[PDB]
């Protein structure tokens, strides 16, 4: 089961910003609100922004930004890359103890999918290897973020600024620096070749073996190397000794080595699935960290 | 592709869940207004069950045997009365975080959150389908037991799933927030059979509507059928029913489309009887059944 972190926290951070005709979502830590830059700009300035030179002629009441009912008011803004930062004169109670992290390719976190301030959906997504990841997202949900919770610690990696034309999305880290090669202005902006997380579907494999699925393994074994070639063939992302080190947990419950698992996962891949589902899937899903699937074992 | 499940926010459920110790065993409860909600079986040891008489269980405890906690602040049991498979401890402390709300017992087919919980800590959310049989397909451990299933309409919270146990296939079964299970299962630690499992014909019929929305649409045909009719053919394919209500709830779709909801019955007919082709329908040979028409309209129109 794909398992979203429990949101509350940062539901309690979501407020709404709006500068002329341009509405979306803030994050209010301490008396700090963040958003996507792009507020900033009208339908005349989308297609090249010059957004210092759009900044320097705005002032504090061309921002207004709604916590529920309240207004806040905006006593100064700065830019950091791609995010606004606009101060407020109050405080957020109910921030929580937070960091900013950019997250590595591969790791998943969850996303509060928010429109008009408003949270309204919450799942689990990857940062697909060509830096995109796959939303759903729609208008009005620009500034909604991604997150990690490790104890009461809520770790930001992402806010939503984009979508691609082929339906994928682009963002940034809270500091304002895009994943991937994309640039917020209004064009139309492919990304790399995606390639699948292999070290992913090998952990979600293990996972179909941990509740007693395994037509799919084999007798046969594979050397790192091999395995790789056969997975760069398919667009599979190379698996390194690393990879191999993390999927240790599963290799040792399911008594499964890793290389031996890698030897399955190459079937698959050469024969198809022929019919068969793994996890009620037909395709092979690679959005489960190694983590992810332990601590839902646990 | 296009469509993931997706959970409500939940925080205003966070803010009602916490735990509940009879002796060792401890358990979830859901903490609204003054009144503490949680699954009945938090009463029983081992020795008691294969079959606890609940009834006499419950006479031997008194107010001062519960120990119901938020974090680690104990709430103050001053009543305690049974309705069904569930236990509501009257407490001395109105949860100030309690939402608007209501209870719910939802249809097979119907979506909702479950907020996984342990101790009464949240350790995770995702969505599931009531399937037929009356069975979830959860993601539940030991200690999970009164975990809660919701859906959120405007600020209003409906529970409609409090969660009891496993059943030896490894699908979950439960009870509505008024303690009457969902299904023919009773809690006690024995192997019961869950019904053989259907496909949930009105969310497949969901998403072929998705799919038409989305540009989808080859698989449409120039006839209709009688509800009667496509009825019969379903149950064949191993197809539930559709009913009344069904063809109700899909009825925004249908208008949203033109589509009338009996000329979709007939395309889906066709499906099952000639198959796919070889042909995909948004990106794959497999129909959904676990998308309901109110989580198309979400996914598609926001
Ligand atoms: C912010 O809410 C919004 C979110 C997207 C709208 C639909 N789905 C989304 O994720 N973001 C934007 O509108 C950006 C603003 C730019 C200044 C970065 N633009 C955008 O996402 O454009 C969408 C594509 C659609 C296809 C296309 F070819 F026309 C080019 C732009
Ligand atoms: C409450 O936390 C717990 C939840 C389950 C533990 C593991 N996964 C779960 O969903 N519920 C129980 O332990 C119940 C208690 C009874 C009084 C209802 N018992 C239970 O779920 O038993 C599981 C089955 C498994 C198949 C079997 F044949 F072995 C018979 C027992």
Same mark, same amino acid.
């Given at each position: 089961?794909?398992?979203?972190?429990?949101?509350?926290?940062?539901?309690?951070?979501?407020?709404?910003?709006?500068?002329?005709?341009?509405?979306?979502?803030?994050?209010?830590?301490?008396?700090?609100?963040?958003?996507?830059?792009?507020?900033?700009?009208?339908?005349?300035?989308?297609?090249?922004?010059?957004?210092?030179?759009?900044?320097?002629?705005?002032?504090?009441?061309?921002?207004?930004?709604?916590?529920?009912?309240? $207004?806040?008011?905006?006593?100064?803004?700065?830019?950091?890359?791609?995010?606004?930062?606009?101060?407020?004169?109050?405080?957020?109670?109910?921030?929580?103890?937070?960091?900013?992290?950019?997250?590595?390719?591969?790791?998943?976190?969850?996303?509060?999918?928010?429109?008009?301030?408003?949270?309204?959906?919450?799942?689990?997504?990857?940062?697909?290897?060509?830096?995109?990841?796959?939303?759903?997202?729609?208008?009005?949900?620009?500034?909604?973020?991604?997150?990690?919770?490790?104890?009461?610690?809520?770790?930001?990696?992402?806010?939503?600024?984009?979508?691609?034309?082929?339906?994928?999305?682009?963002?940034?880290?809270?500091?304002?620096?895009?994943?991937?090669?994309?640039?917020?202005?209004?064009?139309? $902006?492919?990304?790399?070749?995606?390639?699948?997380?292999?070290?992913?579907?090998?952990?979600?494999?293990?996972?179909?073996?941990?509740?007693?699925?395994?037509?799919?393994?084999?007798?046969?074994?594979?050397?790192?190397?091999?395995?790789?070639?056969?997975?760069?063939?398919?667009?599979?992302?190379?698996?390194?000794?690393?990879?191999?080190?993390?999927?240790?947990?599963?290799?040792? $419950?399911?008594?499964?080595?890793?290389?031996?698992?890698?030897?399955?996962?190459?079937?698959?891949?050469?024969?198809?699935?022929?019919?068969?589902?793994?996890?009620?899937?037909?395709?092979?899903?690679?959005?489960?960290?190694?983590?992810?699937?332990?601590? $839902?074992?646990?």
């Amino acid at each position: 089961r794909k398992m979203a972190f429990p949101s509350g926290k940062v539901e309690g951070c979501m407020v709404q910003v709006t500068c002329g005709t341009t509405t979306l979502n803030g994050l209010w830590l301490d008396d700090v609100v963040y958003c996507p830059r792009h507020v900033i700009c009208t339908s005349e300035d989308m297609l090249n922004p010059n957004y210092e030179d759009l900044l320097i002629r705005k002032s504090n009441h061309n921002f207004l930004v709604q916590a529920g009912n309240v $207004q806040l008011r905006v006593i100064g803004h700065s830019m950091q890359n791609c995010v606004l930062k606009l101060k407020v004169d109050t405080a957020n109670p109910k921030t929580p103890k937070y960091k900013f992290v950019r997250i590595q390719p591969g790791q998943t976190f969850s996303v509060l999918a928010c429109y008009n301030g408003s949270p309204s959906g919450v799942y689990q997504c990857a940062m697909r290897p060509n830096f995109t990841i796959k939303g759903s997202f729609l208008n009005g949900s620009c500034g909604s973020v991604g997150f990690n919770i490790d104890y009461d610690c809520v770790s930001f990696c992402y806010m939503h600024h984009m979508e691609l034309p082929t339906g994928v999305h682009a963002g940034t880290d809270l500091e304002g620096n895009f994943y991937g090669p994309f640039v917020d202005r209004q064009t139309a $902006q492919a990304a790399g070749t995606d390639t699948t997380i292999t070290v992913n579907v090998l952990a979600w494999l293990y996972a179909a073996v941990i509740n007693g699925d395994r037509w799919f393994l084999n007798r046969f074994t594979t050397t790192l190397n091999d395995f790789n070639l056969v997975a760069m063939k398919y667009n599979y992302e190379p698996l390194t000794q690393d990879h191999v080190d993390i999927l240790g947990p599963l290799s040792a $419950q399911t008594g499964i080595a890793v290389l031996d698992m890698c030897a399955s996962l190459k079937e698959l891949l050469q024969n198809g699935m022929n019919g068969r589902t793994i996890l009620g899937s037909a395709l092979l899903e690679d959005e489960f960290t190694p983590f992810d699937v332990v601590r $839902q074992c646990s």
